Amino acid sequence: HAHAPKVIVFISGSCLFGAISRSLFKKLPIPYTVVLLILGAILGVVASNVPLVEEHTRDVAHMDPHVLLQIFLPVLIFESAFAMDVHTFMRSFSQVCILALFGLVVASVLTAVLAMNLFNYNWNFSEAMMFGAIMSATDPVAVVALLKDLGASKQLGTIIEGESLLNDGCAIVIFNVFMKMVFFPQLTSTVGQNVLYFLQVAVAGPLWGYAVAKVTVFFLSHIFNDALVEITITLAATYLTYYIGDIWLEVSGVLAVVVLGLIVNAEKTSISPEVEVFLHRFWEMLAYLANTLIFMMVGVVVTQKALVAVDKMDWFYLIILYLAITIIRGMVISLFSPILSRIGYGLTWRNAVIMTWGGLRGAVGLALALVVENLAGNDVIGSKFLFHTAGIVVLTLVINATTIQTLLRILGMSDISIPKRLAMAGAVRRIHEGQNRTLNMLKSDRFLADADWDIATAACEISDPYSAREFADMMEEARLRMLKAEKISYWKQFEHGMLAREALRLLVQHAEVAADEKDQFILVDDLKKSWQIKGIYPWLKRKLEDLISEKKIAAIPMPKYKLGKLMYKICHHMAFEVTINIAIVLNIVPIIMEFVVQDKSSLQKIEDALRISNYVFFVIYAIEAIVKILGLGRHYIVSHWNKFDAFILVVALVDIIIAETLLKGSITINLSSIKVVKLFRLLRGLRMLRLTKALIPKLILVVNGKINNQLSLGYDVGKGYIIGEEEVGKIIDRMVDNKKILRELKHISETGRLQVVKELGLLQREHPGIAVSVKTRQAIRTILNHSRETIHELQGAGLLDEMEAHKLELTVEIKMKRLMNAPSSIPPPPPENLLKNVSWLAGDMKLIDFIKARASLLHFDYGEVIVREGDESDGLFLIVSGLVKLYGKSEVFEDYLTVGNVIGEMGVLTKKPRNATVTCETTVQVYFITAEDMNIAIDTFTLYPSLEYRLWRVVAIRIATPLIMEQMAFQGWTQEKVKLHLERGYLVDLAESHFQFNIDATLEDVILINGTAYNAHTREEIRSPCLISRTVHKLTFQYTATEEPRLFVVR
Amino acid sequence: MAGAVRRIHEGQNRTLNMLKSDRFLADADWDIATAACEISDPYSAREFADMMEEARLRMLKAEKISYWKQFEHGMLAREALRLLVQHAEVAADEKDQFILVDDLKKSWQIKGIY
Amino acid sequence: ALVEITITLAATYLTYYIGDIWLEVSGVLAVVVLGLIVNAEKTSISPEVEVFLHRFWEMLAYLANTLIFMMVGVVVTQKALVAVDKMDWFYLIILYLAI
Ligand SMILES: CCCCCCCCCCCCCCCC(=O)O
């Protein structure tokens, strides 16, 4: 009607003042919060002198204390929790928890006892404990930001963040408890209520937060391309969680918010790839506003109140307090120096000193002091709290925030690594060369010809910010060369996207650890590359116990008596359990009310209906029984779980007619339900316990998910190691000059590669269900990623405009998000599907049927021999299940093969004796296809994509894949881009031999696989299995009945 | 759109053929072929004038793709591209006149007189 | 980014509040002009701030629309149905044609 709020102007003024202060104090080490405090002091003095601005400032000067506790603190707490790195924090759970909790408790108790002893104020223990809890909360954002800028010791930053978060939460909880104890006394209570109160404060919070987080995460995974809905529902969930936890029920709110934020941050994958950026920015700006407002408020309030009643001697006390709060904390670290030395990452004296000097008090202590001062109404309390808190905050901000950089430099942590320095030098050299080339190109233009050339310095040069016995040499230099080669290979794999993140982090960590270690090659595979592959814990035992618990007979016959099949199918339908579950969950309502009435015309209608409630459900259960028993015969009792259904009904009736409604005898006088009923019969609730039967399969899904995550991590690590080792091998082969070093290096590479391959094969054999799901997800991802790259290239080429490309990209990301919700387990495909999927015969059905007609199944026990070296070719073998070890002479190469591999192709195609004896590592089932049968098939099928053609194309690709690596001279083709590029090429038909094959730009490079060739320049004869380089221009075929000449080109 | 989806199908087939030959992702189930599916088309469902007109539209598509490529590089900004493509399609829908006659349609922006 | 976002929000709120309270000028037109001018000169804005601003204003508008619709539903359901006349419905139909 006549509204004119005066709170917007103050928040906007503080907003602008903070913006100016932050912008101005950028290069200077002094934080802008001191400037904010000074500005608040000036504003408070002015408002005291001038009533006009006092009319606007009194709204926040005497602001209600509860808003500080119930709005500002939760916002800062949730903002701190959200920006966390969940994985690194999880990797240091016990250390952070123990350190934070015990240090907080010890510091609070010691500060409290010092406050009672040293200070002359007559304080009891509760107020002293409140004081300690106020001055035991830290927020060192500056220290962790500086450490991240330095780019080293991420563990220190993670530990600092974890300790700060836990300290803030626990300090707030302790302060709340003790403030309620002090300012609002509530008679006396026994230990019975005290234990319940402690349990409600401690445990009931995190459980509620975890439940809400799980519910909202589940609901967040079914929303597609709706950013607004996701953001709005997340905000609503957070606000409702805090409000319900802290108001409707008396549980703690900060802990629930912390747990919810941590859980949501852990499962950020379900969040669409752009929402979390908006959420992070929103929470950051909210925290910034809260900090600015809190600082201005404390400045004004202290400037008035503390300076009304400040004592000269008090200042002296403050000084000692500072020493105390900078000593005890450090002592705590010393008191825990060895305890966490053997647990987790560990600690060192330099890190301990940095941690001790890195504790800066923040806005939490100021808010608590303001609340305490507002609640009190005298001088001995509230004035002293605020004065001491403000003094401590100012002292810490002035001293530590400015001396931390010098302390870091002294301690030898500001140095720059030589590899980083030389990499930066190379990068800036690259940049200068590119800039010079571009400038030389632009000047030669016709339009931008006479432009002024002051851009040469306007664009400037990106200068380096840093500025400023006969064998061990080659041994060490070759070692570091493998380290850089492995690191760049892993980085390239990441940039492609196949290596994920955690696997890359583990690989690079192992690499640099073994590099800094003295004389041992990285990735010895003994233990450092073993835990992730293993992933062993009673997950599998719990899974097996659940499956054996949920067991049933295969099938029940259908008697032709009565209707038979109709009644049987109506009893066995999923609708049956759907309605029984619905009836139970809607029985939770009546069972709740009677209990309510138990713990308690309205009562008349309550007893009229409630009784109607049981007299209908009982009949419904009876109706189920006649269906679940009849058509099942005795089976009624065969299912050991279903026996529970008989009991529920028997108890129901037995305690409804013989225990209730007495008109014949039975209990009569006995003090049973007749005079009871209010109890005993209430057991109706037992009806709820019946759900478990359907609840058991749900836990299997979560166990499968955990095992799936572990298996995926192990597979990614193994793949990455294998790919890095091959690339590193082809690099070292040409880079190194000496021979003995090269042979040793290749030995150490090959041993580890073979061990990892065998371990991965054994693991895949041990867990069949989830391996199939893992392989499927990685393929769908790889395929979708390549499709997205192709779409982007097509849009860039100009054939497609912007909106169609955007639509197709949206479709692709929707498909990826749908993939992300894939089932955790997939049953293994049958041998028929395995035979069908094989590439060189896939597609048409006639050839598939012809092959399936004659392909015998062979079972081989462990430790047998399938194929002997030097034996004539007889056929192939399709590994359906198991592992096989191939040993052969080429350098005596060895290998391991698994499901989906075929080994007969070379011999069956070129009529040559076998060259590799294969033995079996486990029991193995194989598919044997006779050589005569294959000859008949290849003679029968002679279409354009003939069987002969397809087999030779597969063999040619396999043979020619390693050869290109040679021509690769440090070009980094990643072994995958070459495979793709080669897949584009096809095998040409040598219809005529008198012709001469020409070469040109379209066909690039060509490779010969079978036959022989002669140069068209100097009559140079060349055999089949070799490259031809480029020095040839024309290829001359010839008539040779000994071997068929095969040519495979790429265009 | 038909050409784009044909491109997409060819790339998907090539990638599937490449993976099938792997050693690790060798025996994975091949239901991905339909799980990743195919991005189908959403739409679903006198002797001289011939070569004259067909050559005209060929210049139009060539000019349009050249302007789009210049945009994707970034040298052409946005408003210039919009004006160029607008003039192109206007003169294309117009009957028998080559685009950008430079008389008035490409004159006001160059002039900029006030 | 934080400074830019916060100063933009403060500028908008202060503009409307000062225009509509301290002096008696219209507020909606000033906000319209300010928004149009800022949108025209979005080049000075860092290439990621405007996305956040657009999302923020979109979510605010969505919340306002939902709240307004629920409020009008409740208020009409009570008040209009206390004193609704049978003939009035007829009038409404003609009104539709008119508009
Ligand atoms: C940090 C979160 C946002 C803070 C600013 C939003 C408004 C809450 C605090 C300002 C006072 C208005 C609400 C309390 C009631 C009052 O002060 O009369």
Ligand SMILES: CCCCCCCCCCCCCCCC(=O)O
């Ligand atoms: C669409 C902008 C946000 C709307 C919700 C924020 C709070 C404003 C409206 C809710 C009522 C509270 C403020 C008015 C005072 C009152 O209703 O007592």
